[PDB]
Amino acid sequence: IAHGDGRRPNKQRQYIVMKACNKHHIGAEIELAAADIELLFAEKETPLD
Amino acid sequence: EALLGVYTNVVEFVKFLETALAAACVNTEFKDLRRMIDGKIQFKISMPT
């Protein structure tokens, strides 16, 4: 906005802004017993099995 | 010269229950004997006088 005092005039301006992503990683560890993975595949024998 | 015969055996299959030895035993098929710890037969002999 111009005005009538002795101040210098104002040229038009421009602003240029740069933004970027941030990478984030997540990890969880599960252990499964070897007998538990095995007997999911072993065959049915009896009602107690 | 030529062959005359090629002869083999057939194995005489004798199971436990066909023999008369099972008169001296009592046969029960038991699915999971791998799981048993102990057996137990419990007598209570009341003696008269």
CA–CA distance, B43 with B45 (Å, rounded to integer): 6
Q: Which residues of B touch A46 (CB under 8 A)?
A: 31-32
Measured between CB atoms, does A43 come within 8 Å of chain B?
Answer: no
Method used experimentally: cryo-EM
DSSP structure string for B19-49: SGGGGG------S-SSS----------PPP-
Q: Which of A20, A2, A22 is nearest to A12 (CA)?
A: A2
CA–CA distance, B19 with B27 (Å, rounded to integer): 13
Structure tokens given for A1: 């906005």
What separation in angstroms does the CA of B46 have from each of A16, A34, B43, B49?
106, 53, 10, 10
CA–CA distance, B41 with B25 (Å, rounded to integer): 16
Distance of CA A41 to the CA centre of its chain: 37
Q: Resolution for this model in angstroms, one decimal place?
A: 3.7
